Amino acid sequence: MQIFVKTLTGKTITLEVEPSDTIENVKAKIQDKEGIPPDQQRLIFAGKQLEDGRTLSDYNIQKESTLHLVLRLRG
Amino acid sequence: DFLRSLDWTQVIAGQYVSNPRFNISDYFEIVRQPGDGNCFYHSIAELTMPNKTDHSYHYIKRLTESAARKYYQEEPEARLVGLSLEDYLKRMLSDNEWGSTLEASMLAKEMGITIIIWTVAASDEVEAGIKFGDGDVFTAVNLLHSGQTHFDALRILPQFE
């Protein structure tokens, strides 16, 4: 299933995912497509940061849901 | 006018994102901070403390410690970091240890202020902002995050008041 992820710059990418994908899996897909390390990713849906060992299903994320990707920024 | 037109999306309660595009020097003066690992705290101290010096950042780190005691347990970003509070503090308080969006969110709540981190592309144009707190840009402690690895302090140019 297709879902949407909007990054910090407002750039919106598609990912092909399954309801049983973990949050960790979705991050690895973001990394392969966009080059962003999982360590800096905060994935956010419906006002809450998603937890690594849960699945898209756990949060009722469905076809064509939008996630926000916010980055942890160090300096 | 442009600064008052920014579109902040509240992604999670107390945290907002925007993706306007502009030249940082069109709207801010940049106050450069040393590259010694501490520039996040240097940059906060430049904007919040009177008679700031290269030593002022120690107090900011000390507020970050106080802040962490209260807030580290409910900060969403702490879930990335994965440390106990006492291990987090020990690493936070270490020499040259970089500050981050984690400390910004906690300091915002502790100091009762709004902190904005503006992140710029390799091109130097702004491509995003993250805001910690409900204040606007005119009210906030504005920071510049560049090369993805450095913080400097920003002051609103006098003409935008």
Side-chain angles (χ1 to χ4, degrees):
Chain A
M1 64 170 190
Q2 189 165 68
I3 63 169
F4 292 113
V5 183
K6 179 153 170 233
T7 78
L8 207 40
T9 63
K11 177 196 203 170
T12 308
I13 67 176
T14 46
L15 297 183
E16 196 61 32
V17 291
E18 244 73 61
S20 79
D21 273 315
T22 54
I23 302 313
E24 175 173 285
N25 290 165
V26 178
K27 284 178 176 176
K29 304 182 174 206
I30 290 165
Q31 183 184 47
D32 300 311
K33 178 166 206 147
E34 298 299 302
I36 301 147
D39 273 3
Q40 309 183 3
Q41 306 181 36
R42 308 167 61 203
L43 285 170
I44 277 155
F45 177 61
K48 291 259 214 328
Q49 193 173 289
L50 304 165
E51 291 171 67
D52 282 7
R54 293 211 159 252
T55 66
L56 282 179
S57 212
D58 290 338
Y59 298 106
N60 200 33
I61 296 155
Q62 291 310 120
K63 225 142 82 148
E64 309 103 356
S65 289
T66 308
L67 302 199
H68 283 77
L69 177 70
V70 179
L71 308 177
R72 150 161 189 75
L73 305 181
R74 302 189 80 227
Chain B
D1 193 304
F2 165 70
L3 293 175
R4 298 149 249 270
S5 70
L6 300 161
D7 182 34
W8 290 106
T9 299
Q10 191 169 198
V11 287
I12 162 129
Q15 310 198 357
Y16 303 74
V17 300
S18 66
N19 42 258
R21 289 180 97 125
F22 59 99
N23 302 308
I24 271 290
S25 61
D26 276 1
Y27 308 90
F28 308 87
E29 176 205 333
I30 305 165
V31 186
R32 299 301 176 174
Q33 307 301 137
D36 56 356
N38 304 317
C39 59
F40 168 83
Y41 311 102
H42 285 314
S43 294
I44 296 301
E46 181 73 49
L47 286 166
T48 59
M49 284 165 83
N51 304 325
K52 178 271 198 189
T53 55
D54 284 337
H55 306 293
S56 294
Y57 77 93
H58 287 306
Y59 291 145
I60 302 305
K61 298 197 66 167
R62 235 48 182 190
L63 269 187
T64 307
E65 158 174 33
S66 170
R69 319 207 101 112
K70 280 153 194 185
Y71 305 115
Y72 187 77
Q73 205 141 254
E74 304 192 6
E75 285 280 348
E77 197 166 316
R79 283 162 167 179
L80 278 55
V81 157
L83 303 170
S84 71
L85 169 70
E86 291 289 328
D87 294 348
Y88 167 76
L89 294 180
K90 167 167 196 141
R91 180 193 292 187
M92 191 271 294
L93 292 167
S94 277
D95 293 328
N96 309 298
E97 185 71 25
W98 298 13
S100 73
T101 35
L102 179 48
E103 300 72 27
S105 175
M106 307 185 296
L107 286 169
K109 297 172 175 55
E110 173 80 353
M111 305 180 74
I113 67 174
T114 291
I115 293 155
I116 301 172
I117 298 176
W118 296 106
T119 201
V120 295
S123 63
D124 298 2
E125 71 190 46
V126 169
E127 61 174 24
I130 319 207
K131 181 158 87 69
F132 299 102
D134 301 352
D136 62 6
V137 54
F138 300 98
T139 262
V141 168
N142 289 273
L143 275 25
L144 180 60
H145 179 245
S146 55
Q148 286 202 8
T149 58
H150 188 91
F151 287 105
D152 289 300
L154 300 165
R155 282 193 189 103
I156 305 207
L157 290 175
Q159 68 271 31
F160 310 117
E161 294 192 25

